[PDB]
């Protein structure tokens, strides 16, 4: 909520991705905290398993509800941190409701 | 421009890409958002930090706000706590 | 300090080009035999694989930690 991105670059979302889709490289932000300089999910590589949703300790990477993101060009499908963070901001209200409904189950 | 200031440059051979199509960058950069967060004052020497919401927050960590000299910062939220 | 990964011999092909990719900055490699590391139980068997497959080999002898004498009583010696 405060506005600090949840990911702390533990990079096990990269470790458990079955398709090798997520690429993460990190460095200590000036704050001294740990953040990802580059987080790239290749959606064409991704097979939407949902393990990344599972693996994240801070639950920073989530499987968002939207399924309609068909794109004219292949490059648009490759997603960097800014698109995903922007995707996160747009759908945060529903993502929060969805995680709210299913967390007891997990 | 972006978080870590990605600046494909005036001479790069990649800045060609944005021609006729905008770049993805972020407003409300996080780098400054927690800095905008007030310091959580506490009474106890040590304090927890569920991240807020328990299961929905982060691994629970106990921070030692023992020295006013430094406001403990949970390595996960970047929240400074003022003893 | 675990030694369970220093048990079996491995033969690894020489490392090759890893140029940065222009569109996303991902590492890109043109060498197919890069990520391949075959594991062989004994030095003799690994040498055999190189000879019949025709790859050049340069075996490195196993170096195991030398026995070291330790005894809690010894350091309590004020003398030394």
């Amino acid at each position: 909520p405060s506005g600090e991105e949840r990911c702390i670059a533990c990079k096990l979302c990269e470790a458990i991705c079955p398709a090798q889709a997520i690429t993460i490289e990190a460095e200590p932000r000036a704050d001294g905290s740990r953040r990802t300089t580059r987080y790239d999910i290749d959606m064409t590589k991704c097979i939407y398993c949902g393990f990344c949703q599972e693996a994240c300790p801070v639950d920073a990477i989530v499987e968002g509800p939207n399924f309609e993101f068909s794109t004219e060009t292949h490059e648009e499908l490759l997603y960097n941190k800014e698109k995903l963070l922007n995707n996160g901001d747009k759908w945060e209200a529903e993502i929060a409701a969805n995680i709210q409904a299913d967390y007891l189950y997990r | 421009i972006t978080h870590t200031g990605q600046v494909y440059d005036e001479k790069d051979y990649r800045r060609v890409r944005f021609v006729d199509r905008q770049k993805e960058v972020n407003e409300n950069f996080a780098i400054d958002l927690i800095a905008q967060q007030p310091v959580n004052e506490v009474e106890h020497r040590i304090i927890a930090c569920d991240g807020g919401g328990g299961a929905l927050g982060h691994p629970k960590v106990y921070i030692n706000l023992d020295k006013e000299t430094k406001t403990g910062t949970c390595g996960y939220c970047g929240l400074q706590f003022k003893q | 300090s675990g030694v369970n990964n220093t048990k079996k011999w491995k033969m690894e092909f020489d490392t090759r080009e890893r140029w940065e990719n222009p569109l996303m900055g991902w590492a890109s490699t043109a060498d197919p035999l890069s990520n391949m590391v075959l594991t062989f139980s004994a030095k003799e068997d690994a040498i055999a694989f190189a000879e019949k497959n025709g790859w050049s080999y340069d075996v490195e002898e196993k170096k195991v930690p030398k026995p070291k004498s330790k005894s809690y009583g010894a350091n309590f010696s004020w003398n030394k």
Binding site: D40, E75, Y79, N80, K83 | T4, R17 | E20, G25
Partner: peptide, 24 residues
């Protein structure tokens, strides 16, 4: 309830010596 362009966001990994602009 009552076109993106992908790019690398990391920095230059290997900085390059710049020649001295002072002639010698």
């Amino acid at each position: 309830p009552t076109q993106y362009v992908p790019y690398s966001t990391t920095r230059k990994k290997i900085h390059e010596w710049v020649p001295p602009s002072t002639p010698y």
